[PDB]
Amino acid sequence: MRSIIADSKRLVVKVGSSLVTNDGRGLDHDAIGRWAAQIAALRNEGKEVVLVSSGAIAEGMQRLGWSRRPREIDELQAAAAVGQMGLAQVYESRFAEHGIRTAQILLTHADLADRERYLNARSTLLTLLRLGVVPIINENDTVVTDEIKFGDNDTLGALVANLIEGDALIILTDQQGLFTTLVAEASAGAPELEAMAGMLTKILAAKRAAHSGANTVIASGRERDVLLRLASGEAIGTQLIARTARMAARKQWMADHLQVRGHVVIDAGAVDKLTAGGKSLLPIGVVAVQGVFARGEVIACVNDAGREVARGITNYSSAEAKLIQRKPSGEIEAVLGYMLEPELIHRDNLVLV
Amino acid sequence: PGSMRSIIADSKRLVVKVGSSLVTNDGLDHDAIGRWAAQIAALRNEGKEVVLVSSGAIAEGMQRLGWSRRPREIDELQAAAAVGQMGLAQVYESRFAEHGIRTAQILLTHADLADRERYLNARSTLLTLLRLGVVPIINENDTVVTDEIKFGDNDTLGALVANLIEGDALIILTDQMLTKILAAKRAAHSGANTVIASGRERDVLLRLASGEAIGTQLIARTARMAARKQWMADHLQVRGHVVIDAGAVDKLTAGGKSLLPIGVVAVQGVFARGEVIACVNDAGREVARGITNYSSAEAKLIQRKPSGEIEAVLGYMLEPELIHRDNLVLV
Amino acid sequence: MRSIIADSKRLVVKVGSSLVTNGLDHDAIGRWAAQIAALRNEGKEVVLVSSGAIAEGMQRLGWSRRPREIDELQAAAAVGQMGLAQVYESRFAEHGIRTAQILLTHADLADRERYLNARSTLLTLLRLGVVPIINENDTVVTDEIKDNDTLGALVANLIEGDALIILTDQQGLLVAEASAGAPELMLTKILAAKRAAHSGANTVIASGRERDVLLRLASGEAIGTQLIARTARMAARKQWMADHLQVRGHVVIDAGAVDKLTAGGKSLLPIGVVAVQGVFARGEVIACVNDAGREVARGITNYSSAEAKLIQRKPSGEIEAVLGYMLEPELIHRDNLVLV
Amino acid sequence: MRSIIADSKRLVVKVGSSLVTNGLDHDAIGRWAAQIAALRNEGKEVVLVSSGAIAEGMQRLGWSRRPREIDELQAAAAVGQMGLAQVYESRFAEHGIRTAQILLTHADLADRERYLNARSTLLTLLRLGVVPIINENDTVVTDEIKFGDNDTLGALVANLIEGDALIILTDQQGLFTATLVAEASAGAPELEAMAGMLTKILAAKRAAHSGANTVIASGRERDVLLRLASGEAIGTQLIARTARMAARKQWMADHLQVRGHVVIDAGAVDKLTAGGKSLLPIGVVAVQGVFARGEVIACVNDAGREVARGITNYSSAEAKLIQRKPSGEIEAVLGYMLEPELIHRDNLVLV
């Protein structure tokens, strides 16, 4: 059996607390260095990697002089805010040794339910990946505490995979994988995987991830060089395959969120760029703006004949689009007093027909 | 002797906001950050509670990404912010560490604070950090909200943080004004005074704290406690409340203390975490009012129990208090 | 004691279940309709918050006992709301008065956009001489069904009523007069009076069994208990604007607009906007700044900052062409702003 | 070709503005009311989504032209809503049928608690043999006022009540190749290309998410609803790819959280698995973790196996207070009660 990771370019890697912390003595800096070295080697093979890592609370505890994990939520939130700085600094240092830049990101599930904040976060992350930066993502425990108690960032991992359209979510944990005999391969989202089973949340995370076409691997982080070995095509732990491909999931997602209160009409030059050139839709290609829409909504792109040729997430409101239509991107700032992205609809946020 | 006294000398809890220009060289000015850190450290050691709202993340990001010109596109600005955030904080942590001070990084947006639960969660985080003697360092979360990067310099954030922690004073350190005056108005709504002063003034924070007035001082019309009473009245709901015993009433009225689950005799009606509820005596008289940490159903389960028993009863715990002292008013 | 109702132009009238029900007492509703019609003809603006929906629903569903389960209460409310309104519409129609049905929840009113949308609907209905009839939307929120006293007070806040009148079975609290919100004081009716006073609205609690009670109060005769708000309507409006003010964005307005606002008691129109700074959304409270940079007013914006950028300096009849749609003609309605 | 409506028990009937307005066409409303009454007497459960409020409002306010300003549109809607319902109530009353007015917004239905509250209201009304009449609440949300004709609302109501079919009655015959399409799969991409037809096709796709089929037919057709219910196909019929129960299982899996659950006894397990019944508080042995009204939770047996999952009526704290208690004791314990069930049979699936 070949690991699906060998054919996956964009990976979300989720590392459990137990793997990154030395129970009661803060962070295991050596283990983080090993993860950093592995991720660096993936990055040098051409993979795009986002890291979802726990350990903030344990580091916070150490820095505050607490020997025991606090039971009260406020002390947990405090420890998280104190520890987040340390956890990232360690990752930055170890990644710097390999010439890799990192970034800290804090998200909540709420943010991702809002159309504007979803797009803002997606755009941040895709831009960071384009620039070759490794984003490091955590929950914002100062404002949302739902996952602080019992969660270990499994749901966050799947949400991040959806958010960036990852090819695969890798959950590195203490357990070997799913047991019936260890299940080496199965279909993500299959009912019986739930019966067979914090394994359950990881299986549910795999189902959520498969909604966007992402596959999932659940493997022990105690396995030596586990990420390299998966990337080399060696199957380790349990591999769950999404039923739907990334582009088909994207088309369903666009249809699911499509609104028809407004749209844009685009010229032939823009139509050709979209259909043949694999390009973004720019303001200059917009001939008219009809109706109303807001940043982050899904709108139809209609040709002169009135046929829908594409649909995608708009970066700009209909009123903003009205102001900047037919203008080159370098003129947007003068017209609005600010600019957002140069594209009206980014290529990564649209589908044909 | 008679020269105008700075309100900062009598202000225990301060929000200090430092402009981009002060903290950046047109990357980061590490020496200038050290000076702010040294001044804040001296305030901490005089007994002040300080929260820092600092800009500079984009400039640091630019330097780390090899960009000489500030990007015009929002996504490149957001990327620079996420890169720069890591550096900005590490510098502050280092310079504060030289004075024995712990820091924490906090990211907030105005959207977060518009939700009752998230507002209480953020408030509770910050007040717990101040209790532990940590200096919180607060920035906007530019990954999800791009208003601050686009048009701002964290003036509106400073005033929101002052409201959030009930600061005695917001200090806006600048290069030299409308957004800052509007910030002072917003800060005064919770009873916070504002000082607008040039950060190019030598030892400006120490001199203010020593009682020397510098720049412009704006005094809130309403005091902190009176602003709190108006805020509670504004948000009060009467769908539910708690009845509390005489021991709890005395602790609240005389002792300046929190309302604990053990003092709750009964729970009437319905309420949710982050709502404002009345605390009623056996005679049916409202004696206090405040933000509840727990729902009415949760409160029913834990009433009359010591805080160490909450976890066993619920399967989890939130705060040990039902209503923290900082989140309640009398009558 | 003179009744404060005599100098109150905009009234929220709340009629209790016992008064309106035996199902429904159609004759008693006719009497309330006739009284409200007479107030409307003296020039009062009246919004009605009426109970009775559940009782009517019960009758129409053949239920003799008030149901304990919320689902059955929700059903009875939805069934009964149709009957309760149809009766009111008929009786008001006899006097030439149009009515409208409005369903609101406390949640709606916590959202900045829905608050403004509801307020704007109601103020427009009042301008057109319609009597709005308001009920809770029990289909979606059940916190209150589980007699509309809280709703009355929220409506008074929403439309800036001069007075809330709660008509009940009891004579009052007898206290003839007191300060609304005074700790020492039915309980839900007193708490409603306190909530109402937060927008400057006074409250009267009086027995609906008193003959011609609304007319007599409007003539200046005090009946039942009168609770006076500590703060006036304009001062409460200023507190409400300060409470909701954001400073992420604002508008700069010209001298002509400043004068219309300060002297003329008028709205801020797009044509008076010289510039749009920062960011804001419909339903947020923004500062209006003059050429010298001084804040001269603050109010609820009908339009986002991007929309305002598009329509600044344009007459209202041109907004639709520029945006592809229009909202209100005003950027900030006169009823939704304060000076300084 | 047989109409799917003949085998559909629970119907959402959506009637376009043009059909119901000239003000209001009272005679045309009487005809719809008579047809719906006949369906109701054959045992169908019918929810009506009708337009017309703004037109009625305009008439009552003396306006000959549709207003451009949103506030005047909102006012006309509020005025017109009263008339539109009173007409329907009168005509239905002539056939012995009770009606109810319901106002919903799409936002309401995105919130877990408001969704359940609305679902519960409607299912209770249908059980009681009432015909609900549903409209958008234009007082609070104006997104749909400009261009919408309640097509999206119809589909959301079908999802909400798990309708067997959505019937959209319109001025046009149905969907055209650019030939009338008699039959197709709901949600098929090419139906969108073939096309306010587009919003109706999108409505059919949305409706099919809960297993509801859609019929789009001309309301100018004589006795159109009776003829469909008799099995005569008229207009365009769009068939959902997924069945109602399978869509319900997917919906439950989509919304499942595992932050909390309940453990239930063998008696409750049997009632669920064999008896097709609800989960009552009395069958709950323990409450683990945290959950809120409207969330989807697992029901676990003593052996730790998930046997069902469904929408909870109560929070975990409230469930803790009322576990093992008969329904008549809930009110004393909580100070209020919601539904007697912890998870209604309509809101759960077997696992």
mmCIF file of C-alpha atoms in Angstrom, chain B residues 10-293:
data_model
loop_
_atom_site.group_PDB
_atom_site.id
_atom_site.type_symbol
_atom_site.label_atom_id
_atom_site.label_comp_id
_atom_site.label_asym_id
_atom_site.label_seq_id
_atom_site.Cartn_x
_atom_site.Cartn_y
_atom_site.Cartn_z
ATOM 1 C CA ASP B 10 -3.694 58.658 40.449
ATOM 2 C CA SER B 11 -4.507 55.974 37.802
ATOM 3 C CA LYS B 12 -3.824 52.364 38.711
ATOM 4 C CA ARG B 13 -4.875 50.548 35.506
ATOM 5 C CA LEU B 14 -3.501 51.911 32.270
ATOM 6 C CA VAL B 15 -3.857 51.119 28.609
ATOM 7 C CA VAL B 16 -0.764 52.361 26.788
ATOM 8 C CA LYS B 17 -1.030 52.734 23.031
ATOM 9 C CA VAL B 18 2.115 53.260 21.017
ATOM 10 C CA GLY B 19 1.934 54.502 17.413
ATOM 11 C CA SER B 20 3.644 52.706 14.459
ATOM 12 C CA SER B 21 5.951 55.655 13.799
ATOM 13 C CA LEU B 22 7.352 55.407 17.339
ATOM 14 C CA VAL B 23 8.105 51.684 17.166
ATOM 15 C CA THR B 24 9.309 51.375 13.533
ATOM 16 C CA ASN B 25 12.231 52.837 11.604
ATOM 17 C CA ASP B 26 10.288 54.250 8.594
ATOM 18 C CA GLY B 27 11.722 47.146 10.403
ATOM 19 C CA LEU B 28 11.480 47.617 14.156
ATOM 20 C CA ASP B 29 13.390 50.086 16.269
ATOM 21 C CA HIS B 30 14.523 47.596 18.936
ATOM 22 C CA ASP B 31 16.067 50.321 21.098
ATOM 23 C CA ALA B 32 12.874 52.353 21.224
ATOM 24 C CA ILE B 33 10.931 49.218 22.211
ATOM 25 C CA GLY B 34 13.475 48.680 24.993
ATOM 26 C CA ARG B 35 12.822 52.189 26.241
ATOM 27 C CA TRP B 36 9.036 51.646 26.301
ATOM 28 C CA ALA B 37 9.587 48.326 27.999
ATOM 29 C CA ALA B 38 11.834 49.970 30.611
ATOM 30 C CA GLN B 39 9.271 52.702 31.294
ATOM 31 C CA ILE B 40 6.372 50.252 31.525
ATOM 32 C CA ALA B 41 8.492 48.095 33.827
ATOM 33 C CA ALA B 42 9.026 51.032 36.176
ATOM 34 C CA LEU B 43 5.259 51.689 36.214
ATOM 35 C CA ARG B 44 4.618 48.008 36.974
ATOM 36 C CA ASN B 45 7.040 48.258 39.915
ATOM 37 C CA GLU B 46 5.233 51.314 41.282
ATOM 38 C CA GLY B 47 2.049 49.104 41.368
ATOM 39 C CA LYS B 48 0.381 50.065 38.066
ATOM 40 C CA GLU B 49 -1.452 47.510 35.947
ATOM 41 C CA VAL B 50 -0.551 48.059 32.336
ATOM 42 C CA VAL B 51 -1.925 46.696 29.087
ATOM 43 C CA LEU B 52 0.028 47.524 25.917
ATOM 44 C CA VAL B 53 -1.542 48.144 22.541
ATOM 45 C CA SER B 54 1.329 48.325 20.030
ATOM 46 C CA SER B 55 1.557 48.673 16.217
ATOM 47 C CA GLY B 56 4.580 47.570 14.074
ATOM 48 C CA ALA B 57 3.670 44.093 12.857
ATOM 49 C CA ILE B 58 3.507 45.044 9.172
ATOM 50 C CA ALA B 59 6.829 46.872 9.205
ATOM 51 C CA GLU B 60 8.464 43.851 10.850
ATOM 52 C CA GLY B 61 6.806 41.517 8.389
ATOM 53 C CA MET B 62 8.044 43.631 5.506
ATOM 54 C CA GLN B 63 11.616 43.424 6.805
ATOM 55 C CA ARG B 64 11.400 39.669 7.299
ATOM 56 C CA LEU B 65 9.937 39.139 3.810
ATOM 57 C CA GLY B 66 12.524 41.391 2.128
ATOM 58 C CA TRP B 67 10.031 44.095 1.105
ATOM 59 C CA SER B 68 11.254 47.696 0.923
ATOM 60 C CA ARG B 69 7.859 49.226 0.038
ATOM 61 C CA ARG B 70 4.622 48.851 2.014
ATOM 62 C CA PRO B 71 2.405 46.609 -0.084
ATOM 63 C CA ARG B 72 -0.780 48.088 -1.568
ATOM 64 C CA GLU B 73 -2.715 44.790 -1.809
ATOM 65 C CA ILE B 74 -4.603 43.753 1.357
ATOM 66 C CA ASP B 75 -3.573 40.089 1.253
ATOM 67 C CA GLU B 76 0.151 41.055 1.159
ATOM 68 C CA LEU B 77 -0.517 43.379 4.071
ATOM 69 C CA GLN B 78 -2.221 40.546 5.976
ATOM 70 C CA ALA B 79 0.740 38.229 5.221
ATOM 71 C CA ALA B 80 3.238 40.814 6.416
ATOM 72 C CA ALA B 81 1.166 41.244 9.578
ATOM 73 C CA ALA B 82 1.146 37.499 10.337
ATOM 74 C CA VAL B 83 4.884 37.276 9.727
ATOM 75 C CA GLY B 84 5.636 40.467 11.683
ATOM 76 C CA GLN B 85 3.469 39.631 14.672
ATOM 77 C CA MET B 86 5.910 36.881 15.667
ATOM 78 C CA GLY B 87 8.897 39.269 15.655
ATOM 79 C CA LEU B 88 7.135 42.212 17.336
ATOM 80 C CA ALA B 89 6.150 40.049 20.290
ATOM 81 C CA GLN B 90 9.521 38.303 20.673
ATOM 82 C CA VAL B 91 11.196 41.709 20.978
ATOM 83 C CA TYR B 92 8.751 42.872 23.622
ATOM 84 C CA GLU B 93 9.116 39.607 25.536
ATOM 85 C CA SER B 94 12.952 39.913 25.526
ATOM 86 C CA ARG B 95 13.066 43.530 26.656
ATOM 87 C CA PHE B 96 10.397 42.912 29.372
ATOM 88 C CA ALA B 97 12.234 39.726 30.477
ATOM 89 C CA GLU B 98 15.300 41.881 31.273
ATOM 90 C CA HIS B 99 13.116 43.524 33.953
ATOM 91 C CA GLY B 100 11.630 40.239 35.224
ATOM 92 C CA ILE B 101 8.214 40.855 33.580
ATOM 93 C CA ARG B 102 6.081 38.207 31.844
ATOM 94 C CA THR B 103 4.092 39.198 28.785
ATOM 95 C CA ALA B 104 1.250 37.659 26.863
ATOM 96 C CA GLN B 105 0.090 38.072 23.252
ATOM 97 C CA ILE B 106 -3.588 38.729 22.688
ATOM 98 C CA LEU B 107 -5.333 39.233 19.362
ATOM 99 C CA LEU B 108 -8.784 40.815 19.400
ATOM 100 C CA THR B 109 -11.193 42.283 16.863
ATOM 101 C CA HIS B 110 -14.114 44.691 17.345
ATOM 102 C CA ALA B 111 -16.335 41.849 16.056
ATOM 103 C CA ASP B 112 -15.210 39.550 18.934
ATOM 104 C CA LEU B 113 -16.217 42.184 21.462
ATOM 105 C CA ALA B 114 -19.731 42.638 19.961
ATOM 106 C CA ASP B 115 -20.749 39.158 21.167
ATOM 107 C CA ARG B 116 -21.748 38.968 24.891
ATOM 108 C CA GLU B 117 -19.994 35.660 25.503
ATOM 109 C CA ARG B 118 -16.792 36.529 23.673
ATOM 110 C CA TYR B 119 -16.682 39.942 25.378
ATOM 111 C CA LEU B 120 -16.899 38.237 28.805
ATOM 112 C CA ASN B 121 -14.313 35.610 27.772
ATOM 113 C CA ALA B 122 -11.811 38.278 26.639
ATOM 114 C CA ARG B 123 -12.450 40.421 29.687
ATOM 115 C CA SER B 124 -11.932 37.445 31.972
ATOM 116 C CA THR B 125 -8.679 36.488 30.215
ATOM 117 C CA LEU B 126 -7.285 40.006 30.605
ATOM 118 C CA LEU B 127 -8.354 40.487 34.223
ATOM 119 C CA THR B 128 -6.803 37.115 35.111
ATOM 120 C CA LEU B 129 -3.556 38.095 33.396
ATOM 121 C CA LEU B 130 -3.479 41.425 35.343
ATOM 122 C CA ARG B 131 -4.125 39.559 38.631
ATOM 123 C CA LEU B 132 -1.114 37.340 37.853
ATOM 124 C CA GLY B 133 1.085 40.383 37.156
ATOM 125 C CA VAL B 134 1.467 39.727 33.430
ATOM 126 C CA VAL B 135 1.628 42.602 30.895
ATOM 127 C CA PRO B 136 -0.826 41.772 28.085
ATOM 128 C CA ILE B 137 0.184 42.957 24.638
ATOM 129 C CA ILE B 138 -2.834 43.417 22.426
ATOM 130 C CA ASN B 139 -3.102 43.619 18.662
ATOM 131 C CA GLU B 140 -5.794 43.435 16.045
ATOM 132 C CA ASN B 141 -6.278 40.096 14.366
ATOM 133 C CA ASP B 142 -5.517 41.176 10.776
ATOM 134 C CA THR B 143 -5.984 37.626 9.491
ATOM 135 C CA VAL B 144 -9.773 37.921 9.939
ATOM 136 C CA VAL B 145 -10.543 41.719 10.081
ATOM 137 C CA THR B 146 -8.696 44.217 7.868
ATOM 138 C CA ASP B 147 -10.140 47.553 9.082
ATOM 139 C CA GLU B 148 -7.165 48.331 11.362
ATOM 140 C CA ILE B 149 -4.512 47.722 8.678
ATOM 141 C CA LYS B 150 -6.464 49.596 5.990
ATOM 142 C CA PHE B 151 -7.249 52.961 7.639
ATOM 143 C CA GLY B 152 -6.073 52.707 11.300
ATOM 144 C CA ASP B 153 -3.280 52.984 13.853
ATOM 145 C CA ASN B 154 -5.002 51.073 16.694
ATOM 146 C CA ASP B 155 -6.612 54.179 18.216
ATOM 147 C CA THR B 156 -10.059 52.542 18.177
ATOM 148 C CA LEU B 157 -8.509 49.332 19.584
ATOM 149 C CA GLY B 158 -6.973 51.260 22.515
ATOM 150 C CA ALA B 159 -10.336 52.726 23.495
ATOM 151 C CA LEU B 160 -12.036 49.327 23.169
ATOM 152 C CA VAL B 161 -9.374 47.759 25.396
ATOM 153 C CA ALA B 162 -9.835 50.542 27.945
ATOM 154 C CA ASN B 163 -13.622 49.833 27.984
ATOM 155 C CA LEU B 164 -12.986 46.084 28.102
ATOM 156 C CA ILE B 165 -10.759 46.108 31.229
ATOM 157 C CA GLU B 166 -12.262 49.246 32.804
ATOM 158 C CA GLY B 167 -9.015 51.159 32.596
ATOM 159 C CA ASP B 168 -8.488 54.282 34.650
ATOM 160 C CA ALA B 169 -6.658 55.868 31.742
ATOM 161 C CA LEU B 170 -5.806 55.399 28.082
ATOM 162 C CA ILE B 171 -2.445 56.885 27.071
ATOM 163 C CA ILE B 172 -2.040 57.556 23.379
ATOM 164 C CA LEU B 173 1.615 58.102 22.507
ATOM 165 C CA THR B 174 2.034 59.676 19.102
ATOM 166 C CA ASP B 175 4.352 61.711 16.817
ATOM 167 C CA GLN B 176 2.794 65.149 17.684
ATOM 168 C CA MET B 177 -5.815 64.039 15.764
ATOM 169 C CA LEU B 178 -9.547 63.446 15.041
ATOM 170 C CA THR B 179 -9.537 59.658 15.434
ATOM 171 C CA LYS B 180 -7.622 60.068 18.704
ATOM 172 C CA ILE B 181 -10.211 62.534 20.058
ATOM 173 C CA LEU B 182 -12.991 60.171 19.014
ATOM 174 C CA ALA B 183 -11.017 57.397 20.789
ATOM 175 C CA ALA B 184 -10.906 59.523 23.930
ATOM 176 C CA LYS B 185 -14.726 59.902 23.714
ATOM 177 C CA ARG B 186 -15.181 56.159 23.377
ATOM 178 C CA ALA B 187 -12.774 55.523 26.309
ATOM 179 C CA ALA B 188 -14.612 58.003 28.503
ATOM 180 C CA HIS B 189 -17.790 55.998 28.058
ATOM 181 C CA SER B 190 -16.396 53.519 30.635
ATOM 182 C CA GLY B 191 -15.012 56.353 32.795
ATOM 183 C CA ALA B 192 -11.470 56.183 31.392
ATOM 184 C CA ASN B 193 -9.491 59.398 31.097
ATOM 185 C CA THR B 194 -7.217 59.914 28.110
ATOM 186 C CA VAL B 195 -3.786 61.481 27.679
ATOM 187 C CA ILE B 196 -2.502 62.283 24.248
ATOM 188 C CA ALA B 197 1.221 62.951 24.292
ATOM 189 C CA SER B 198 4.204 62.809 22.006
ATOM 190 C CA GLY B 199 6.212 59.613 22.362
ATOM 191 C CA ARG B 200 9.262 61.727 21.370
ATOM 192 C CA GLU B 201 9.098 63.317 24.861
ATOM 193 C CA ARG B 202 11.936 61.972 27.062
ATOM 194 C CA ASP B 203 10.658 59.454 29.679
ATOM 195 C CA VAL B 204 7.131 60.487 28.952
ATOM 196 C CA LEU B 205 5.420 57.607 30.858
ATOM 197 C CA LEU B 206 7.569 57.994 34.015
ATOM 198 C CA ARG B 207 7.027 61.760 34.042
ATOM 199 C CA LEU B 208 3.228 61.356 33.699
ATOM 200 C CA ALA B 209 3.173 58.720 36.434
ATOM 201 C CA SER B 210 5.231 61.042 38.654
ATOM 202 C CA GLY B 211 2.413 63.624 38.205
ATOM 203 C CA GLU B 212 3.897 65.870 35.494
ATOM 204 C CA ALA B 213 1.277 66.749 32.862
ATOM 205 C CA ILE B 214 2.489 66.401 29.283
ATOM 206 C CA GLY B 215 0.471 66.862 26.085
ATOM 207 C CA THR B 216 -3.309 66.931 26.320
ATOM 208 C CA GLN B 217 -5.338 65.457 29.151
ATOM 209 C CA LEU B 218 -9.028 64.632 28.574
ATOM 210 C CA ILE B 219 -11.123 63.930 31.636
ATOM 211 C CA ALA B 220 -14.154 61.634 31.488
ATOM 212 C CA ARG B 221 -17.425 63.279 32.587
ATOM 213 C CA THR B 222 -18.501 60.091 34.360
ATOM 214 C CA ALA B 223 -16.568 58.101 36.949
ATOM 215 C CA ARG B 224 -15.721 54.413 36.533
ATOM 216 C CA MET B 225 -18.299 53.034 38.985
ATOM 217 C CA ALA B 226 -21.102 55.282 37.654
ATOM 218 C CA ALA B 227 -20.280 54.227 34.064
ATOM 219 C CA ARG B 228 -20.423 50.623 35.229
ATOM 220 C CA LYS B 229 -23.874 51.188 36.793
ATOM 221 C CA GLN B 230 -25.220 52.716 33.569
ATOM 222 C CA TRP B 231 -23.708 49.799 31.580
ATOM 223 C CA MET B 232 -25.385 47.225 33.843
ATOM 224 C CA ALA B 233 -28.734 49.046 33.636
ATOM 225 C CA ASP B 234 -28.412 49.258 29.889
ATOM 226 C CA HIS B 235 -27.890 45.468 29.527
ATOM 227 C CA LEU B 236 -30.089 44.203 32.370
ATOM 228 C CA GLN B 237 -32.600 41.457 31.513
ATOM 229 C CA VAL B 238 -35.363 40.308 33.843
ATOM 230 C CA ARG B 239 -36.196 36.917 32.292
ATOM 231 C CA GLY B 240 -34.206 35.429 35.197
ATOM 232 C CA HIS B 241 -32.387 36.201 38.429
ATOM 233 C CA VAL B 242 -30.832 34.705 41.557
ATOM 234 C CA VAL B 243 -31.857 34.862 45.202
ATOM 235 C CA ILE B 244 -28.912 35.136 47.551
ATOM 236 C CA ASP B 245 -28.567 34.690 51.312
ATOM 237 C CA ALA B 246 -27.701 37.304 53.957
ATOM 238 C CA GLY B 247 -24.086 36.130 54.175
ATOM 239 C CA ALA B 248 -23.726 36.706 50.432
ATOM 240 C CA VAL B 249 -25.547 40.068 50.646
ATOM 241 C CA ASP B 250 -23.127 41.246 53.357
ATOM 242 C CA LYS B 251 -20.077 40.089 51.403
ATOM 243 C CA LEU B 252 -21.334 42.009 48.355
ATOM 244 C CA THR B 253 -22.403 45.190 50.166
ATOM 245 C CA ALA B 254 -19.709 45.487 52.843
ATOM 246 C CA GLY B 255 -16.854 43.206 51.751
ATOM 247 C CA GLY B 256 -16.434 44.342 48.096
ATOM 248 C CA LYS B 257 -16.478 40.623 47.128
ATOM 249 C CA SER B 258 -17.684 38.358 44.300
ATOM 250 C CA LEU B 259 -20.921 36.340 44.322
ATOM 251 C CA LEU B 260 -20.063 32.664 44.653
ATOM 252 C CA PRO B 261 -22.367 29.719 43.879
ATOM 253 C CA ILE B 262 -22.422 28.830 47.594
ATOM 254 C CA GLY B 263 -24.308 32.074 48.370
ATOM 255 C CA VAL B 264 -27.122 31.332 45.890
ATOM 256 C CA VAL B 265 -30.339 30.191 47.545
ATOM 257 C CA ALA B 266 -32.422 29.904 44.377
ATOM 258 C CA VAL B 267 -32.413 30.392 40.642
ATOM 259 C CA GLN B 268 -35.551 31.827 39.035
ATOM 260 C CA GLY B 269 -36.345 32.016 35.342
ATOM 261 C CA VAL B 270 -33.726 31.772 32.594
ATOM 262 C CA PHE B 271 -30.387 33.401 31.751
ATOM 263 C CA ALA B 272 -27.217 32.688 29.814
ATOM 264 C CA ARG B 273 -23.523 33.330 30.331
ATOM 265 C CA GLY B 274 -22.634 36.967 29.680
ATOM 266 C CA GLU B 275 -26.090 38.356 30.455
ATOM 267 C CA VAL B 276 -26.731 40.857 33.230
ATOM 268 C CA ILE B 277 -28.937 39.522 36.056
ATOM 269 C CA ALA B 278 -30.385 40.859 39.299
ATOM 270 C CA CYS B 279 -29.300 39.434 42.637
ATOM 271 C CA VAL B 280 -32.289 39.453 44.950
ATOM 272 C CA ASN B 281 -32.478 39.072 48.732
ATOM 273 C CA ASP B 282 -34.921 36.809 50.675
ATOM 274 C CA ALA B 283 -37.257 39.825 50.987
ATOM 275 C CA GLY B 284 -37.419 40.111 47.162
ATOM 276 C CA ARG B 285 -35.351 43.339 47.042
ATOM 277 C CA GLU B 286 -32.712 43.698 44.287
ATOM 278 C CA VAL B 287 -29.379 44.285 46.058
ATOM 279 C CA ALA B 288 -26.958 43.880 43.113
ATOM 280 C CA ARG B 289 -26.666 43.260 39.477
ATOM 281 C CA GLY B 290 -23.945 41.810 37.273
ATOM 282 C CA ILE B 291 -22.682 39.657 34.457
ATOM 283 C CA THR B 292 -23.296 35.923 35.110
ATOM 284 C CA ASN B 293 -20.566 33.403 34.282
#
